[PDB]
Amino acid sequence: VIRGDEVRQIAPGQTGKIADYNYKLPDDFTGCVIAWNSNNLDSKGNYNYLYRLFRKSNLKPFERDISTEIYQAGSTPCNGVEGFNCYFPLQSYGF
Amino acid sequence: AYTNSFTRGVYYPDKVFRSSVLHSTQDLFLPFFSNV
């Protein structure tokens, strides 16, 4: 589930937000990507759907983990609802 | 604990039926005449 401005990471193909951090394809990927404009199906404001903000490194293809994995710049691991120099991984988005 | 190992983990280089050929496949394989 992606927006309309972010079709261009999977056509023709580069790294990005949606590419590295949300649904990753291989760097030498030769298979078929599946995509269609389906505005009437997600829309019903649909604020239930989620996304990932940012990560320390660019991820490998087909990764899904429901884990509390925080982005941070320092080496010290932060925990809680808010962390020092810490951005939250899982956030909702609206359509 | 060290043990000398001869020719462990050698595998066919493809899924292809291989016969009567000298196949020069550079491939990720375990080395020979080592210790495990």
Binding site: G4, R64 | Y12, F32
Partner: protein, 192 residues
């Protein structure tokens, strides 16, 4: 001890491969002369990041090598040659046959492997002025085009390409792949 069991798992691109073979053993602690030719059956997905595993059993460490084989008419592995073991087997790998005649054989050459990556960045934190130049209210006419020199940027070029507002982005003398990792001397911006 009677049984020796092993499997090979290789993790590339999120895949999780399974190779299967069983082998009887008559030795307690040492390893026998013979081989173990495994055969794959099924490949699975995982979806998670795996760096450690925890469990009669054996572990392997994998390094890339070069190998040259020989096959009979029936289709069975007769012998195998590790082309980086000793330079005799490297000569066997170069000459494509397992018999080597008498002489000097010019196999390959070498160069020193690096130890680590050394990056000499300019040690200043700053956002580059492409946020300010592109977001300008006033542009000029085409015969009297504005010119700007931009000197110090440590921030990335990722906002150049990768946006749907930038409809036409033909780069002639450079690829858009090179934009994220480059280092240059001067930046000129012309606007009309």
């Amino acid at each position: 001890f009677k049984n020796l069991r092993e499997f090979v798992f290789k993790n590339i691109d999120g895949y999780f491969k399974i190779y299967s073979k069983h082998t009887p053993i008559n030795l307690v602690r040492d390893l026998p002369q013979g081989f173990s030719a495994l055969e794959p059956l099924v490949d699975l997905p995982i979806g998670i990041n795996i760096t450690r595993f925890q469990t009669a059993y054996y572990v392997g460490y994998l390094q890339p090598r070069t190998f040259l084989l020989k096959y009979n008419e029936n289709g069975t592995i007769t012998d195998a040659v590790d082309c980086a073991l000793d330079p005799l087997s490297e000569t066997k790998c170069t000459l494509k046959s397992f018999t080597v005649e008498k002489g000097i054989y010019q196999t390959s050459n070498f160069r020193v492997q690096p130890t680590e990556s050394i990056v000499r960045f300019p040690n200043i934190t700053n956002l580059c002025p492409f946020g300010e130049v592109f977001n300008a209210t006033r542009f000029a006419s085409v015969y009297a085009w504005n010119r700007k020199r931009i000197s110090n940027c440590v921030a990335d070029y990722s906002v150049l390409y990768n946006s749907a507002s930038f409809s036409t982005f033909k780069c002639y003398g450079v690829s858009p792949t090179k934009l994220n990792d480059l280092c240059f001397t001067n930046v000129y911006a012309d606007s009309f």
